[PDB]
Write a protein that binds this ligand. Sequence first.
Ligand SMILES: COCCNc1cc(-n2c3c(c4ccccc42)C(=O)CCC3)ccc1C(N)=O
Length: 208
Amino acid sequence: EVETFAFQAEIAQLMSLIINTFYSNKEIFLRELISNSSDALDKIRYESLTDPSKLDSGKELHINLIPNKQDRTLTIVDTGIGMTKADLINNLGTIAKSGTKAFMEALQAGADISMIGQFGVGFYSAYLVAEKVTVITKHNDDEQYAWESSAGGSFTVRTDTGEPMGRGTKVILHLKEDQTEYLEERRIKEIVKKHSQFIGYPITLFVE
Ligand SMILES: COCCNc1cc(-n2c3c(c4ccccc42)C(=O)CCC3)ccc1C(N)=O
Protein backbone atom coordinates (compact mmCIF):
# COMPACT_ATOMS: atom_id res chain seq x y z
CA GLU A 1 0.00 0.00 0.00
CA VAL A 2 0.96 3.64 -0.48
CA GLU A 3 0.51 5.94 2.51
CA THR A 4 0.11 9.69 1.93
CA PHE A 5 1.05 12.28 4.56
CA ALA A 6 0.72 16.05 4.92
CA PHE A 7 3.90 18.03 5.55
CA GLN A 8 3.66 20.21 8.62
CA ALA A 9 2.86 23.79 7.62
CA GLU A 10 6.40 25.16 8.14
CA ILE A 11 8.00 22.48 5.94
CA ALA A 12 5.43 22.99 3.17
CA GLN A 13 6.18 26.72 3.46
CA LEU A 14 9.92 26.15 3.13
CA MET A 15 9.44 23.84 0.15
CA SER A 16 7.31 26.48 -1.55
CA LEU A 17 9.95 29.15 -0.90
CA ILE A 18 12.63 26.92 -2.40
CA ILE A 19 10.46 26.32 -5.50
CA ASN A 20 9.20 29.93 -5.88
CA THR A 21 12.12 32.18 -4.89
CA PHE A 22 14.26 33.53 -7.74
CA TYR A 23 17.75 32.24 -6.91
CA SER A 24 20.30 31.37 -9.60
CA ASN A 25 22.92 29.56 -7.45
CA LYS A 26 21.09 26.22 -7.61
CA GLU A 27 24.25 24.06 -7.69
CA ILE A 28 24.47 24.06 -3.89
CA PHE A 29 21.81 21.33 -3.78
CA LEU A 30 24.55 18.77 -4.50
CA ARG A 31 26.83 19.72 -1.61
CA GLU A 32 23.80 19.53 0.72
CA LEU A 33 22.88 16.02 -0.39
CA ILE A 34 26.52 14.86 -0.27
CA SER A 35 26.69 16.38 3.26
CA ASN A 36 23.62 14.34 4.24
CA SER A 37 25.33 11.23 2.87
CA SER A 38 28.58 12.07 4.71
CA ASP A 39 26.69 12.56 8.00
CA ALA A 40 24.88 9.22 7.50
CA LEU A 41 28.18 7.48 6.78
CA ASP A 42 29.79 9.06 9.89
CA LYS A 43 26.83 7.79 11.93
CA ILE A 44 27.01 4.13 10.91
CA ARG A 45 30.84 4.23 11.13
CA TYR A 46 30.67 5.51 14.72
CA GLU A 47 27.94 3.06 15.71
CA SER A 48 29.97 0.16 14.23
CA LEU A 49 32.85 0.84 16.66
CA THR A 50 30.69 -0.45 19.51
CA ASP A 51 28.60 -2.90 17.49
CA PRO A 52 30.70 -4.27 14.55
CA SER A 53 27.69 -6.36 13.41
CA LYS A 54 26.03 -3.13 12.21
CA LEU A 55 28.26 -3.51 9.13
CA ASP A 56 27.00 -7.03 8.36
CA SER A 57 24.74 -5.22 5.87
CA GLY A 58 27.88 -3.90 4.13
CA LYS A 59 31.36 -2.75 5.14
CA GLU A 60 32.05 -0.30 2.31
CA LEU A 61 31.37 3.34 3.20
CA HIS A 62 31.06 5.37 0.02
CA ILE A 63 29.01 7.78 -2.09
CA ASN A 64 28.00 7.22 -5.73
CA LEU A 65 26.69 9.91 -8.06
CA ILE A 66 24.67 8.48 -10.92
CA PRO A 67 23.31 10.56 -13.80
CA ASN A 68 20.76 9.10 -16.20
CA LYS A 69 19.76 11.16 -19.22
CA GLN A 70 17.11 8.61 -20.30
CA ASP A 71 15.18 9.00 -17.00
CA ARG A 72 16.40 12.59 -16.50
CA THR A 73 17.48 11.68 -12.97
CA LEU A 74 20.52 12.35 -10.80
CA THR A 75 20.88 9.78 -8.05
CA ILE A 76 23.02 10.26 -4.93
CA VAL A 77 23.69 6.86 -3.35
CA ASP A 78 25.35 6.19 -0.01
CA THR A 79 25.97 3.20 2.24
CA GLY A 80 25.25 5.27 5.36
CA ILE A 81 23.02 4.44 8.33
CA GLY A 82 19.80 4.77 6.29
CA MET A 83 16.40 5.76 7.67
CA THR A 84 13.59 3.89 9.43
CA LYS A 85 9.90 4.36 8.66
CA ALA A 86 9.67 6.53 11.79
CA ASP A 87 12.57 8.68 10.55
CA LEU A 88 10.72 9.23 7.25
CA ILE A 89 7.29 9.97 8.71
CA ASN A 90 7.98 11.63 12.06
CA ASN A 91 11.55 12.16 13.28
CA LEU A 92 13.13 14.06 10.41
CA GLY A 93 10.13 16.41 10.09
CA THR A 94 10.00 17.05 13.83
CA ILE A 95 13.66 18.12 13.87
CA ALA A 96 13.30 20.05 10.59
CA LYS A 97 10.43 22.21 11.91
CA SER A 98 12.72 24.29 14.12
CA GLY A 99 15.47 24.40 11.48
CA THR A 100 12.92 25.63 8.94
CA LYS A 101 11.66 28.33 11.32
CA ALA A 102 15.21 29.59 12.00
CA PHE A 103 16.17 29.43 8.31
CA MET A 104 13.13 31.38 7.17
CA GLU A 105 13.86 34.01 9.85
CA ALA A 106 17.50 34.29 8.74
CA LEU A 107 16.29 34.71 5.15
CA GLN A 108 13.90 37.50 6.23
CA ALA A 109 17.36 39.03 8.17
CA GLY A 110 19.27 38.97 4.85
CA ALA A 111 20.71 35.44 4.68
CA ASP A 112 20.56 33.59 1.36
CA ILE A 113 19.40 30.13 0.26
CA SER A 114 22.98 28.77 0.11
CA MET A 115 23.14 28.96 3.92
CA ILE A 116 20.34 26.34 4.24
CA GLY A 117 22.73 23.64 5.55
CA GLN A 118 23.56 25.68 8.65
CA PHE A 119 19.94 25.08 9.70
CA GLY A 120 19.98 21.29 9.22
CA VAL A 121 17.36 21.36 6.43
CA GLY A 122 19.72 21.22 3.41
CA PHE A 123 17.81 18.20 2.04
CA TYR A 124 14.99 20.45 0.81
CA SER A 125 17.44 22.27 -1.46
CA ALA A 126 16.86 19.24 -3.73
CA TYR A 127 13.76 21.14 -4.93
CA LEU A 128 15.94 23.85 -6.48
CA VAL A 129 16.60 21.43 -9.35
CA ALA A 130 14.08 18.56 -8.95
CA GLU A 131 10.34 18.49 -9.68
CA LYS A 132 10.10 15.26 -7.68
CA VAL A 133 12.40 13.59 -5.19
CA THR A 134 12.35 9.89 -4.46
CA VAL A 135 14.28 8.57 -1.49
CA ILE A 136 14.93 4.82 -1.26
CA THR A 137 16.39 3.86 2.09
CA LYS A 138 17.32 0.87 4.20
CA HIS A 139 18.23 1.01 7.90
CA ASN A 140 19.49 -2.09 9.77
CA ASP A 141 16.51 -1.96 12.15
CA ASP A 142 13.80 -1.77 9.45
CA GLU A 143 12.66 -2.69 5.92
CA GLN A 144 13.45 -0.90 2.64
CA TYR A 145 11.19 2.13 2.08
CA ALA A 146 10.52 4.58 -0.74
CA TRP A 147 9.67 8.14 0.31
CA GLU A 148 8.50 10.49 -2.43
CA SER A 149 7.31 14.07 -2.86
CA SER A 150 6.65 16.53 -5.66
CA ALA A 151 5.95 19.10 -2.93
CA GLY A 152 2.41 20.50 -3.04
CA GLY A 153 2.11 19.78 0.69
CA SER A 154 2.17 15.96 0.69
CA PHE A 155 4.60 13.04 0.58
CA THR A 156 4.15 9.27 0.26
CA VAL A 157 5.87 6.36 1.95
CA ARG A 158 5.65 2.76 0.77
CA THR A 159 7.64 -0.44 1.20
CA ASP A 160 10.11 -0.64 -1.69
CA THR A 161 10.24 -3.68 -3.99
CA GLY A 162 13.14 -2.50 -6.19
CA GLU A 163 16.73 -3.79 -6.08
CA PRO A 164 17.59 -4.52 -2.38
CA MET A 165 20.22 -2.07 -1.09
CA GLY A 166 21.81 -3.82 1.91
CA ARG A 167 21.99 -0.55 3.89
CA GLY A 168 21.96 3.14 3.04
CA THR A 169 20.09 5.74 1.01
CA LYS A 170 19.42 6.64 -2.60
CA VAL A 171 18.12 10.15 -3.27
CA ILE A 172 16.68 10.18 -6.79
CA LEU A 173 16.31 13.67 -8.22
CA HIS A 174 13.78 13.81 -11.05
CA LEU A 175 15.22 16.94 -12.59
CA LYS A 176 13.22 19.92 -13.85
CA GLU A 177 13.27 20.26 -17.64
CA ASP A 178 15.63 23.27 -17.53
CA GLN A 179 18.05 21.74 -15.00
CA THR A 180 19.56 18.95 -17.11
CA GLU A 181 23.05 20.51 -16.80
CA TYR A 182 23.31 18.46 -13.59
CA LEU A 183 23.45 15.28 -15.69
CA GLU A 184 26.68 16.42 -17.40
CA GLU A 185 29.89 14.77 -16.18
CA ARG A 186 31.94 17.98 -16.36
CA ARG A 187 29.29 19.98 -14.49
CA ILE A 188 29.06 17.47 -11.62
CA LYS A 189 32.89 17.21 -11.43
CA GLU A 190 33.07 21.00 -11.22
CA ILE A 191 30.50 21.17 -8.39
CA VAL A 192 32.04 18.35 -6.31
CA LYS A 193 35.52 19.90 -6.66
CA LYS A 194 34.19 23.34 -5.62
CA HIS A 195 31.95 22.40 -2.66
CA SER A 196 32.67 18.81 -1.63
CA GLN A 197 36.40 18.32 -2.11
CA PHE A 198 37.15 17.20 1.47
CA ILE A 199 34.38 14.70 2.12
CA GLY A 200 35.96 11.79 4.02
CA TYR A 201 34.48 9.06 1.82
CA PRO A 202 35.12 8.04 -1.79
CA ILE A 203 32.75 9.82 -4.17
CA THR A 204 32.40 7.96 -7.47
CA LEU A 205 30.90 9.88 -10.38
CA PHE A 206 29.37 7.32 -12.72
CA VAL A 207 29.37 8.11 -16.41
CA GLU A 208 26.62 7.46 -18.93
C1 LIG B 1 22.30 10.80 9.97
O1 LIG B 1 21.60 10.53 8.76
C2 LIG B 1 20.21 10.28 8.93
C3 LIG B 1 19.43 11.10 7.91
N1 LIG B 1 19.92 10.92 6.54
C4 LIG B 1 19.31 11.51 5.46
C5 LIG B 1 18.20 12.34 5.61
C6 LIG B 1 17.56 12.98 4.54
N2 LIG B 1 16.45 13.70 4.79
C7 LIG B 1 15.28 13.21 4.35
C8 LIG B 1 14.27 14.14 4.84
C9 LIG B 1 14.94 15.18 5.63
C10 LIG B 1 14.49 16.30 6.32
C11 LIG B 1 15.46 17.06 6.97
C12 LIG B 1 16.82 16.72 6.94
C13 LIG B 1 17.31 15.60 6.24
C14 LIG B 1 16.39 14.80 5.58
C15 LIG B 1 12.82 14.00 4.55
O2 LIG B 1 11.95 14.60 5.15
C16 LIG B 1 12.51 13.03 3.44
C17 LIG B 1 13.41 11.79 3.47
C18 LIG B 1 14.93 12.02 3.48
C19 LIG B 1 18.07 12.73 3.25
C20 LIG B 1 19.17 11.91 3.02
C21 LIG B 1 19.83 11.30 4.09
C22 LIG B 1 20.99 10.39 3.84
N3 LIG B 1 21.67 10.47 2.70
O3 LIG B 1 21.20 9.51 4.67
